[PDB]
């Protein structure tokens, strides 16, 4: 229980990260922290409901990895020759 609240606080912290971070990689990082908050909550509740939540959290980790591969791949691809990685440098597409 004491942990669950820390999980929520962490997720919030990650949200703050995403909203605050100026560069792509670091926004992505803040997202990773959020994911981890979720994982911790999954562990606590697994400890309440019996272990399926651990397998869950592990699958979650795997998934996270996959999207890290693709996401960093994208970040590198788009910004390789291009200059500074600040994500607001791409504002061409306007509503």
């Amino acid at each position: 229980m004491s942990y669950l609240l820390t999980s929520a606080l962490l997720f919030a912290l990650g949200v703050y990260g995403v909203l605050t971070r100026r560069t792509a990689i670091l926004v992505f990082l803040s997202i990773e922290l959020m994911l981890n908050a979720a994982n911790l909550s999954l562990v606590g509740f697994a400890r309440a409901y019996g272990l399926d939540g651990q397998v869950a959290a592990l699958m979650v980790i795997a998934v996270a990895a996959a999207e890290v591969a693709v996401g960093l791949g994208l970040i590198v691809a788009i910004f390789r020759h291009r200059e500074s990685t600040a994500v607001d440098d791409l504002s061409e597409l306007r509503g």
Binding site: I61, A62, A65, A69, L72, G73, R80
Partner: protein, 92 residues
Amino acid sequence: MAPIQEYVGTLIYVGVALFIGVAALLVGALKRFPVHFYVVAMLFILFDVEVAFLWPYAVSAGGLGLYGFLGVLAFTLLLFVGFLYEWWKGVM
């Protein structure tokens, strides 16, 4: 399985090791750039995952029988289709 004491012991061990590290330090007081090194880093972060799944099988394996083995086989073959791809694609 293991008594919880030995994780604490692990941590203590870490403490000693770190302190000694600090000690030795104080005796010190006495284009294409990403591609390769990215691809072969990403594949690390994938094989770590693979193995992270293979370990739970390797322990409870004979208990899981031919269907368990079949599962681990399928899994392995999928991921190796991936690796075989980025191998046949080439990495340099």
